């Protein structure tokens with residue numbers, strides 16, 4: 001608009017830099033291509049000089065790592081925090097029956113921790129598993145529609161072992177230890 | 180072919196431009212190579228074809244040059260077992 | 263007749279869209295707190311709870327929770343150099359977003375005055391400069407607003423998109439205003455040549 | 459005319475090559491189940507215990523999650539709309555050329571044919587891209603067969619025919635100006 | 641390692657290009673239909 005304005009507003013000059021030819025000139029400069037018309041006036045050349053400098057800085061930065069952004073397979077997750085489980089209902093989750101990761105839900109007064117328990121009780125078929133590896137394996141076969149809740153150390157062990165199809169999301173919710 | 184089609188088919192313009200079947204190939208080739216001279220499309224339909232071709236060229240050429248840097252800078256790869 | 267008509271509609275639309283954007287606090291949807299939080303820990307337990315927010319340029323407010331419908335003034339000078347002081351001063355003062363509103367208003371007067379002093383032609387040109395200048399001021403305001411907010415997810419609101427939409431309309435009016443100035447002189451020169 | 463004849467021959471070659479490529483099974487040579495000469499619709503067997511057994515490819519295999527952008531790529535792939543749409547447009551182009559001979563007065567049927575052939579070529583590009591993109595989302599060596607190149611060749615023929623139809627449209631409209639010059 | 645670009649990683653720019661060519665032909669034809677109809681009246 002400015003290039004068209006400066007090159008045509010003056011009645012004492014009556015260039016080919018109309019409104020539509022100005023759009024083409026600016027587009028050609030940014031695309032790193034050539035022009036068919038070039039301004040012949042001081043005001044017009046200032047507009048075309050700062051637009052070439054702007055183009056140079058912007059096209060150099062963009063082309064820096066264009067291939068890297070095109071060849072990156074970023075690791076995306078469905079959920080990050082425990083709060084996500086409460087807010088949805090599609091995926092499921094449970095805990096090791098007769099365990100210390102279960103009693104922590106029943107005896108907690110926190111809103112998030114009380115809500116998740118509610119979802120568990122009325123979850124047919126039951127989500128609790130009598131043995132550890134009966135849950136972690138059911139997760140693998142569930143097509144992603146289950147999230148086990150187990151301690152950090154075990155989840156790190158069952159994360160480096162093949163088939164590495166399981167992983168950890170977010171950080172711990174409580175700090176405790178064995179004895 | 181599209182650039183030639185939209186620039187010559189209409190009989191309500193007659194040769195309105197130099198964009199024949201032979202100069203369209205030359206224009207497209209120059210644009211892709213990041214060279215170019217002589218003629219640029221002046222009709223609305225022709226400008227659209229040139230604009231997308233310029234956009235297409237910018238991504239492909241930049242991707243080639245950016246990726247070629249990695250090939251020229253391949254770091255020495257080593258087998259898994261290294262001790 | 264149909265070109266002047268569009269200019270008046272465009273000028274009114276662009277001016278209305280920009281003043282609404284300045285006056286409505288729905289520029290950004292992010293996470294934050296509303297209460298001053300510096301209440302000398304009178305209640306203490308009622309610590310700042312991070313809730314969905316809809317900030318603006320002058321005042322923030324809460325979008326959910328127990329504090330819903332509570333607002334607050336945005337502290338742009340929290341508790342250094344020449345690159346993080348002038349930028350915040352511009353952002354705090356919002357000179358450019360306000361300047362864009364002023365220029366659009368000034369341009370409207372020139373269009374309004376272009377139906378009384380029809381013999382004068384530089385009035386229409388002055389309007390074109392104001393509408394183009396207003397668009398350039400709207401660019402700076404958007405850049406400053408985004409740059410300051412970079413000082414973790416967010417989503418720009420309708421108010422942000424009203425100023426952006428105002429820039430496009432203002433630039434279109436500027437082109438239409440310059441084209442009227444160009445056409446006027448062409449007619450004036452054509453008639454003068456015919457008389458010669 | 460000589461130019462007209464080459465257009466008629468080109469139209470029938472492009473239609474035949476595109477039609478064959480759709481119906482054939484030697485688009486790709488890859489290792490899997492049924493060396494396998496995978497096709498556009500059904501994959502078959504090569505050197506092995508089975509050598510003729512063919513099976514309809516499962517374009518929606520369950521292994522996870524179906525991204526909404528990945529669900530629409532596999533829908534276009536599975537239905538091969540673009541390769542089929544390339545055949546239809548080439549067929550329409552042939553009819554328009556034939557219809558021109560019967561009338562020879564309209565002049566707007568020779569342009570219509572040119573649009574179809576150019577449009578047919580553009581559809582074939584999409585079909586090629588969709589076919590390659592879908593395969594690249596699966597697993598360490600592969601090579602395309604003659605069926606794939608028959609579709610690629612048909613694109614070149616179709617575009618060449620499209621140019622001829624436009625040139626005939628231009629030429630016929632030039633003669634009218636000369637006749638209307640006196 | 642240093643991987644080579646695949647058509648999947650660039651097919652997006654191919655769909656815009658084909659879309660632009662189709663749009664350009666549509667624009668040209670629309671202006672053709674307008675002039676052709678107008679010429680009949682005149």
Ligand SMILES: CCCCCCCC/C=C/CCCCCCCC(=O)OC[C@H](O)CO
Pocket residue numbers: 020021023024027030221222223224226227
């Ligand atoms: C840098 C990012 C840019 C993003 C945005 C890209 C699009 C910009 C539009 C350009 C106008 C091109 C077309 C101009 C057509 C001028 C000619 C015209 O309208 O018609 C005259 C002709 O003689 C009879 O039609």
Ligand SMILES: NS(=O)(=O)c1cc2c(cc1Cl)N[C@H]([C@H]1C[C@H]3C=C[C@@H]1C3)NS2(=O)=O
Pocket residue numbers: 175176177178
């Ligand atoms: N969050 S923290 O690191 O300050 C932290 C660290 C720890 C906490 C509690 C907290 Cl809040 N409790 C545990 C305790 C709970 C029972 C298990 C281990 C001891 C006895 N010790 S710890 O692991 O040292």
Ligand SMILES: CCCCCCCCCCCCCCCC(=O)O
Pocket residue numbers: 227230231234656
């Ligand atoms: C004429 C020159 C420009 C040619 C067309 C350029 C189109 C740019 C890319 C298409 C719009 C994409 C919008 C973002 C969508 C998304 O992120 O999901």
Ligand SMILES: CCCCCCCCCCCCCCCC(=O)O
Pocket residue numbers: 344345346348349352402
């Ligand atoms: C002759 C007219 C010139 C008009 C120049 C307008 C633009 C000036 C700069 C605007 C932004 C001010 C600087 C903010 C950023 C910073 O310094 O931190």
Ligand SMILES: CCCCCCCCCCCCCCCC(=O)O
Pocket residue numbers: 365384387388391392395
């Ligand atoms: C601080 C930045 C201000 C930007 C906006 C200022 C616009 C000024 C417009 C003046 C137009 C003058 C045109 C007529 C001149 C004349 O009488 O010859």
Ligand SMILES: CCCCCCCCCCCCCCCC(=O)O
Pocket residue numbers: 527528530531534584588655658659662663
């Ligand atoms: C105006 C006509 C245009 C015709 C060409 C447009 C083609 C658009 C893309 C078609 C195939 C898209 C396949 C899915 C892509 C994806 O979401 O990954």
Ligand SMILES: CCCCCCCCCCCCCCCC(=O)O
Pocket residue numbers: 547566569570573574577669672673676677
């Ligand atoms: C996807 C391919 C679509 C192909 C569409 C072909 C259109 C051909 C148009 C030929 C010109 C028709 C002009 C008629 C004008 C009129 O009489 O009103």
Ligand SMILES: CCCCCCCCCCCCCCCC(=O)O
Pocket residue numbers: 227230231527655656659660663
């Ligand atoms: C100047 C002309 C520009 C033409 C722009 C045409 C845009 C075509 C876009 C095709 C998108 C294909 C479908 C992708 C769907 C998705 O993954 O979101």
Ligand SMILES: *C(=O)CCCCCCCCCCCCCCC
Pocket residue numbers: 577580581661662663665666669670672673
């Ligand atoms: C006058 O108004 C004529 C209208 C003609 C409309 C049809 C033209 C379609 C051109 C675009 C075709 C794009 C094909 C892309 C591959 C399928």
Ligand SMILES: N[C@@H](CCC(=O)O)C(=O)O
Pocket residue numbers: 095096098099100101102149150151
């Ligand atoms: N370590 C806990 C069990 C951990 C779990 O169930 O995830 C216990 O001894 O009860």
Ligand SMILES: [Ca+2]
Pocket residue numbers: 063064244245
């Ligand atoms: Ca480089």
